Every structure is written in C-alpha cells, then in structure tokens.
Amino acid sequence: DDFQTHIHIRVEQRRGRKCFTTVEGIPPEFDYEKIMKYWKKWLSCNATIVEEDEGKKVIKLNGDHRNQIQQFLSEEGIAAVDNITIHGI
RNA sequence: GGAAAAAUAAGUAAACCCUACCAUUUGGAACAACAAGAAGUCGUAACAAGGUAUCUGUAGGUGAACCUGCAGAUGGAUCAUUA
Ligand SMILES: [Mg+2]
Ligand SMILES: [Mg+2]
Ligand SMILES: [Mg+2]
C-alpha cells in the first residue's frame, strides 16, 4: 500500500552526446504547463509532455538536467531528497 | 569757541540662516551592461535554391535562434518567349 510521492529522473540517450532528461512521477495535481514553461526558460531547452499507459504524464527535456531539477523540486517542496531518485547512465 | 565717550538717521554691507536653481566634483540604497576569447548548455536562424530564396518597414506570437501576416528590394536562384 504505497500512496507516497516518489519521483524518477531518467537520463536517456537521444543521439551521440545529445540526450533526454525524463521526469517521471509528478503528482497529477500540478499544472504541468507552468513547469514546462519555467523549465524551458530556466534551463534553456525544448521539452515535451508525454502520455503513458493512459494515466502517466512525464516531462521530457532535451539535455542532461537532473541536479538542476532535483534542486527545483526540493526547493519547491514537491518532494524530499529521499523521494527523488536520479537514474543516470 | 574747539573737542573724546555716548547716542541718532540714512547708507555701504561682511557673515549666518530660509526658498529656487546653475556649474565642477563626489558618497550612494536599488538597477545594471558592453567588447574580446574559447573544449560548457538547448537547438540550427544565416552563407549552396542552408534544404521554407534572403533582406527592409510594420504588427502579432514565442526556451532559443526565429516564425507568421501585410506592402516592399535584388544585394536573386530570372537582364530573356503571344503563335
Ligand atoms: Mg544646492
Ligand atoms: Mg560571445
Ligand atoms: Mg516583437
């Protein structure tokens, strides 16, 4: 029985050195578009909203943003460092 | 008669305040650039018909260059086709 907030931050290879930072497990209650906007400007990126398995909304930024983001979430109290997991490879 | 102090009226007017400014410097909360360089980030606007020809004025949109509307210029990729 898990209702708590856990956030998975992926880094996926696009082509060559270029990549993706995929933010997964943002609670549905937050307007994703505002985070889209503010992140595009904050990080200087293009980014997208992606629909998975009919319920799951993920954020896809170009380039590797993980620490910037984890900091954004802790600072904005969307999570504790324990609930934010960062998988890079 | 002469004449010092002391007083008197008007003037010259230093200095010190109050108002409003000018000049030459200067302290300063708060804002805050620019040029140069290159092994940071996102993309690839422009050079070739840069891959949607560019570019000017304007107006709107917008992570970013930029994009789109209207009128314009070849500095164009056309000096050129009535039968
Ligand atoms: Mg003065
Ligand atoms: Mg520079
Ligand atoms: Mg404008």
Q: Among residues A30, A23, A27, A34, which one has the least CA distance to residue A71?
A: A23
Find the nucleotide nearest A19 (Cα to C1′): B42
Classify residue A5 as exposed, middle or buried by CB count within 10 Å of its CB (0-12, 13-18, 19+): middle
Q: Name the DSSP class of A4.
A: S
Give the phi and the psi of residue A7 in degrees, each rounded to 5: -115, 125
Question: Solved by what technique?
Answer: X-ray
Residue A16 CB neighbours (<10 A): 6
Q: Using a 7 Å cut-off to protein CB atoms, list the covered nucleotides of chain B.
A: 41-43, 63-64
CB A89 within 8 A of CB A11: yes
Q: Among residues A12, A3, A2, which one has the least CA distance to residue A66?
A: A12
Q: How far does the CA of A42 sit from the C1' of B11, in Å?
A: 79
